[PDB]
Amino acid sequence: EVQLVQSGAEVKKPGESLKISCKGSGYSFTNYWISWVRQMPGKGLEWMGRIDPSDSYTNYSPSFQGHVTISADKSISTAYLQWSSLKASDTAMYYCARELYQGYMDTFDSWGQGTLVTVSSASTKGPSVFPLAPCSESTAALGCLVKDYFPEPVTVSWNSGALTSGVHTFPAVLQSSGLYSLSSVVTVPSSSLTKTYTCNVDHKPSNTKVDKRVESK
């Protein structure tokens, strides 16, 4: 099986150095070029550059020119992407890709699974969790506001995973502060508010966990 596998996710501060990797297996590494592609959160794909692993010849986009160095180490069939000084603007998913020439063009026929790189001045912080209850019907909404954490992600469950139906946990937004925030809500029968509702908020990075009972009041 042709297969490119990338190193793990990174959380870094601006000014730091980073080298991420991509190891090919199931083919002749020196025989196929390797492209790197940036995908910013919510955005499309950006070709950064390429390299012929056999002699380490490199091509860069006029955009990524100089700001990033691509390299190859055929000793153990591994390609590299590296920065000397990261900026918060470098925050993105990064994919390595195998260039397979066919029909007279270079095609990205095989892709690594992606490396998430988050760059921020912020420091690790568990979230505060606030109830979302209606002021003083058909369906009724209640929720939890999970505020001021870093980095992503948190996971929310309701009533220890006992409640999954009708829950929406929204994608996190990045605040001015550099900290994330997100809401989780659930709609329930208005004749239940009887039933107790508690959101469980787990934040692995801060090794932290918060249960919040959401009172009908």
């Binding site: 270079d106 095609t107 990205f108 002021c135 994608p171 605040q175 809401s183």
Partner: protein, 214 residues
Amino acid sequence: DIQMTQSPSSLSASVGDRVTITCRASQSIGLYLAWYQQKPGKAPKLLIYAASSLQSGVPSRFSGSGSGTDFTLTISSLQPEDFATYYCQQGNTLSYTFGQGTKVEIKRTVAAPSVFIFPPSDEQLKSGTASVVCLLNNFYPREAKVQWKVDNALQSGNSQESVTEQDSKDSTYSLSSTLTLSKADYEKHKVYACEVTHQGLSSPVTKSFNRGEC
């Protein structure tokens, strides 16, 4: 330096539809166009190369056409696993450049949001910040206008929103909007309102509460 522009940016389609996505090159590029599909959280996947050559393993319901400046991707009978984002890429010259992508979403019938508003908790207010939350539940299509009014005055630049992906059961969206204020600003005003405009509503729906008296 060849600009790749895809159309449309997004489209809704039903299972069994024929779907066409177009790609225009800022200059000629011959036949050197490739199509990629990407699902959320996953790496892209090659579908077509050389404008019309079907990549090994890819279902024949996928086909490409065009030459020079104009190219099309056709999906002849959309299957459930085809809802995704599609990228074209020119391979004429370096740098390699990708189109901005076309997202294929699921068509369904118009559905009006259920709307809810949530005051700040007392717990948050102690930290000295006030978050007001407005929720739009299960609506279709995605386009929705949410406006915050405080003391009946339109707010700007002090709120953020996010939207879910289409629900796996009913294919609707849900939306959350957050107005953030300092506790002292929060306490000066009385009336907090979320005004929602959307296709399935005859006219805007307003949800509100009065600070202190709730």
